[PDB]
Design a protein around this ligand. Structure first.
Ligand code: PLP
Ligand code: PLP
Lengths: 384, 77, 388, 77
């Protein structure tokens, strides 16, 4: 294969060639470059048709109605829109919000802004395996609790939350439930016609779509409402104003179409490679799996390596393009209870559509002799 | 003239841009030549639906806009 | 030529072939598809380099420093960011904002949102050539005035505001000045090292870049600060969080580079084509120029046709892809702000030119307008009334 | 070792990601082989500047980080 080997699909993925060649047809003069807001001519009407096709492809993946799909600039905005939008709309019912310590920054920082605006937020600590204890969640809920935000798949450790149960808990108490599904979309099955989720965020560049585009699911029945954060013409049915980037939208739709198609087979292959990689390193003396092997995403493997200096670990695996989630170490691992040194020598392996058996075996061997020769030079390992 | 529609679409209660959104999706899952009865009460549809026909190469068979609810017979081009 | 003829560059422009050529290199596996935030490997570091190049290309166009450039999802966001960001940061000094009734929705709607948040906003009526009277602007300013937002070039009538003068008025009183330059960028010369503008918004798809990308200039000296409206990691120096769309940013940068280069020549050519169009229709009996021919953008021509039904006007000129500014119903809020009655505003056409516009297309347009207005006025009971 | 720099760069007062932003730009209008003296007091530069050299294929001639201000001599590769 080629070097370095890309094992950072969770940071972003390459745009699928099929997705890319679709986008190319909605940019230049002899393409559908029109503005989907120009109602007086066909350049705009045809651009709107492409937008609608992509809107339905996105909806079909998550089992929603196209009218529930609101286009954003990405998952960051979607998380901001959902949380701030619901928090502001339902503040007359209360101002208390519940979330998790291991949520993506888009969620955590949004909640922090809301605290500065008078809202009260509870950040729940997860279990050692990353799972939220639903009884601790229940104990946090109150009369004035209006909103809960807990992600489907964790982007660092890949742990899967029980969003169905959480939805049941929320709906029963009239609490709005938001789910950040940026990592789960196109990986774990999602059906909003069954799920009791009110708001759900997803992106494009995590499932081989382009960066700079995303969407927000807003439940139509029972009707959920939000206050727009982006003003200027009341586009997206009053929920997100601005020109619709057709080429981006088309790319995201096409990506969601392909996902629905190759989902079952691809995720089998992924967790197959995922188990192949863990089996190949699990017998190294002092390594630790962060998350859950049996109910984690099929594409993420977060492993901690003991008695090795973190800085040098990332250099020893120079042949791999991975992530440590880091001067300061991952706030997610810190939340799990990892001491700062252990968190620094933790590697997040994320697999994808181009990952092969060959690359995994090469990775397994690289890890074996890297950890071995690092612990040789390690005064740290000598004391162990 | 509204007697033999192949498909029907209850768009009552829907407001722009929803009516046309539902029309786009329904017309896409239709065979070329089939007909769709569209029932709406969004005043904007008196402009939007014939516009959908003009700019999207479809045929507007018959409309009813002199009272509520409105009625539009569309034939997929 | 081909039909219909595209004369709606103000709504959006086609992506330049060179621009799309560059964008396609930052997408797939064999390109630079990396995340500019991945500091642990090369995929991230070289995507970040491309972002920097495009960031300097953008800054060089408007005579700013790259550190003053904040990437957004478009001009709408930039307008929201600037106005809400400044209003919130400087609210201890006052809660009064001033703007124009002819501003783009992104500015107007953002202001109404701040109004329901406790802010007080003054919407100034323009003179009927579109120009804001600076004396009425000054009369609106107060102790508690923290922010003024007035656009460079109007998107509907193309009128140019004296942003330098407005900047002087603002800086002298310690008032933040925001300019929406979405329509003026790459068309009128801009130098922030001279201009007294604190915040300026621009886009990509108005200047042959791709939609879904934009930027907000935030003045570095004298330092101007704003509250971020998008949270999640504090990217863009804490002013706008979220992943950086490399291919988009590269496209906008390449477009701004091309702009700086072909600006002087292209604008003279468009100014010529614009004058060619007006001179070919100005002698029609009851037509009116909306804006200012001598200090209006070189690319925009908004004309009113009297004694014709507006609805049929758009249908008669179906060979042309233009705009009336109508909303959805009712007519342009910019035109009625100028004082046009609903009927006249309905029968107004905004011709906007671009770098694909030919003399051949303009002459076709001239003939079509002459022929169509004459044809319509014949069938027009309204016109019969005028002839008496 | 710091005596013969072709170009200088006062990055004092700058904070990540600014210092590296200014380095990218300055290195861009530099001839391959010329040297740049970077003065900085941003702690992150101790990591970020050699990182700029590693991932951008440039050569770090000499660093000085035992106090303020820091000093980095790079040679355009
Ligand atoms: C990547 C990611 C986001 C951010 O998505 P963007 O479109 O890049 O802003 C949010 N949440 C999770 C879990 C993510 O992995
Ligand atoms: C088009 C336009 C905008 C909006 O630009 P987007 O990038 O599409 O959000 C804002 N202001 C003016 C004057 C415009 O012409």
């Amino acid at each position: 294969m080629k070097l370095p080997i890309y094992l950072d699909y969770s940071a972003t993925t390459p745009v699928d060639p099929r997705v890319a060649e679709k986008m190319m047809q909605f940019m230049t003069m002899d393409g559908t470059f029109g503005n989907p807001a120009s109602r007086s001519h066909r350049f705009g009407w045809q651009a709107e048709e492409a937008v609608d096709i992509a809107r339905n492809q996105i909806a079909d993946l998550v089992g929603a109605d196209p009218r529930e799909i609101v286009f954003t600039s990405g998952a960051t905005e979607s998380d901001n829109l959902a949380i701030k939008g619901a928090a502001n709309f339902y503040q007359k019912k209360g101002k208390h919000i519940i979330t998790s310590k291991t949520e993506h920054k888009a969620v955590l920082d949004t909640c922090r802004q809301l605290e500065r605006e008078g809202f009260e937020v509870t950040y729940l600590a997860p279990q050692r395996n990353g799972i939220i204890d639903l009884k601790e969640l229940e104990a946090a809920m109150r009369d004035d609790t209006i909103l809960v935000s807990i992600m489907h798949v964790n982007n660092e450790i890949g742990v899967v939350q029980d969003i169905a149960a959480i939805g049941e808990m929320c709906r029963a108490r009239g609490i709005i439930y938001h789910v950040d599904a940026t990592q789960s979309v196109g990986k774990l099955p999602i059906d909003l016609s069954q799920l009791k989720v009110d708001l759900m965020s997803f992106s494009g560049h995590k499932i081989y779509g382009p960066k700079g585009i995303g969407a927000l699911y807003v439940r139509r029945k029972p009707r959920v409402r939000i206050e727009a954060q982006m003003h200027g013409g009341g586009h997206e049915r009053g929920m997100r104003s601005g020109t619709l980037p057709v080429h981006q939208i088309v790319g995201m739709g096409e990506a969601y179409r392909i996902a629905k198609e190759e989902m079952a087979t691809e995720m089998e292959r992924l967790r197959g490679l995922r188990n192949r990689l863990w089996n190949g390193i699990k017998d190294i003396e002092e390594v630790y799996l962060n998350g859950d092997l049996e109910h984690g995403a099929p594409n993420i493997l977060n492993v901690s390596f003991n008695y090795v200096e973190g800085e040098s670990l990332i250099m020893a695996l120079k042949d791999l393009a991975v992530s440590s989630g880091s001067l300061e170490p991952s706030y997610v691992l810190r939340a799990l209870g990892l001491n700062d040194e252990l968190a620094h020598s933790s590697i997040r392996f994320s697999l994808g559509r181009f990952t092969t058996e060959e690359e995994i075996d090469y990775t397994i061997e690289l890890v074996r002799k890297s950890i071995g020769r690092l612990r040789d030079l390690s005064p740290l390992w000598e004391m162990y | 003239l509204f007697s033999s529609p192949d498909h029907t679409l209850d768009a009552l209660g829907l407001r722009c841009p929803e009516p046309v959104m539902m029309v786009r999706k329904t017309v896409r899952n239709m065979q070329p030549g089939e007909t769709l009865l569209i029932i709406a009460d969004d005043p904007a549809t008196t402009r939007d639906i014939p516009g959908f026909c003009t700019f999207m190469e479809h045929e507007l068979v018959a409309k009813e806009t002199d009272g509520l609810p409105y009625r539009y017979l569309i034939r997929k081009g």
